[PDB]
């Protein structure tokens, strides 16, 4: 593990003892899955073994988690949960707790709610939690109801839209502390308030502090001139 | 190279181009099956 990852582990371990949820908002390419997996890799305490974890994620990502668990923590055993209704139904028999962790997609967890309500999951890893950004969403409304010790969000480039989404993400992290969007109309007059509210739970890295061995992105904007056929249509519009 | 594009209708036009000038290519629309994504990523690593 790298130094910033280990400092992440000590920080997460403090939050774990304190019973505090938060955002592991490192910049993409620094090992946010690897950090979450290290909540198991060094976990001699055994509490995290004999009760099931959920990983909930957007669809393309279901693969990497399996490879990352199997490469870093062969101490564990992992369940797929996607594909045919038949395979889902079959796998429900095996978790009817050596099924130490289950890998899942947002689009299935928002439907198979009845099955997920049947068991007391220890923790939810909501991978790339920027998916949950709107409280108007069924996804958000339903994902609030599952019961667990911690809800862990691994979303890089978080928040960054409008204050309704800030409230939605922060109230997903804590059911207390926040009641309405009106608080966030009163929260450098604005910026400092938000910074101090986020600081107890919201790690950062920024690439240039840690990716010292990588090249910087050379970023080109190339202007193009549209063709005669494009002119005729664009004008007609 | 990775090419990113914001319309499935356009990724079809790009595929017609990749076939015409014979570059070799591989595409992963949201309409691709979850099992295809696994093979297709694992083939973009591990190969020249």
């Amino acid at each position: 593990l790298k130094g910033y990852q280990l400092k992440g582990m000590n920080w997460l371990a403090n939050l774990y003892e304190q019973g505090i949820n938060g955002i592991l908002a490192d910049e993409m390419g620094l090992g946010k899955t690897v950090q979450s997996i290290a909540l198991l890799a060094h976990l001699a305490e055994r509490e995290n073994i004999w009760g099931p974890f959920l990983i909930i994620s957007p669809a393309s990502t279901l693969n990497n988690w399996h490879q990352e668990f199997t490469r870093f923590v062969p101490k564990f055993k992992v369940l797929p949960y996607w594909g045919n209704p038949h395979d889902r139904k079959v796998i429900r028999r095996f978790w009817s707790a050596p099924f130490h962790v289950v890998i899942t997609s947002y689009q299935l967890v928002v439907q198979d709610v009845k099955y997920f309500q049947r068991v007391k999951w220890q923790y939810m890893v909501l991978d790339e939690a920027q998916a949950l950004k709107s409280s108007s969403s069924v996804r958000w409304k339903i994902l609030l109801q599952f019961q667990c010790r911690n809800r862990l969000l691994l979303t890089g480039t978080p928040i960054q839209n409008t204050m309704a989404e800030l409230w939605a993400l922060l109230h997903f992290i804590m059911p207390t502390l926040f009641d309405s969007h009106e608080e966030f109309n009163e929260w450098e007059n604005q910026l400092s308030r938000l910074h101090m509210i986020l600081k107890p739970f919201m790690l950062r890295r920024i690439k240039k502090d840690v990716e010292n061995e990588l090249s910087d992105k050379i970023e080109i904007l190339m202007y193009c001139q549209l063709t005669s056929r494009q002119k005729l249509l664009y004008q007609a519009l | 190279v990775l090419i990113y594009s914001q319309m499935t209708r356009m990724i079809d036009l790009l595929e017609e181009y990749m076939v015409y000038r014979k570059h070799t290519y591989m595409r992963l629309d949201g309409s691709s099956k979850i099992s295809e994504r696994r093979d297709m990523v694992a083939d973009f690593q591990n190969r020249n």
Partner: peptide, 29 residues
């Protein structure tokens, strides 16, 4: 008496875990 249902349910257990092994390894590719 009870051995029939017991060894049947034991056979169903190895049947289940064989399906678990197979349908877990469907996630490889």
């Amino acid at each position: 008496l009870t051995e029939e249902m017991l060894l049947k349910r034991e056979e169903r257990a190895r049947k289940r875990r064989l399906q678990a092994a197979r349908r877990a390894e469907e996630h490889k590719n």
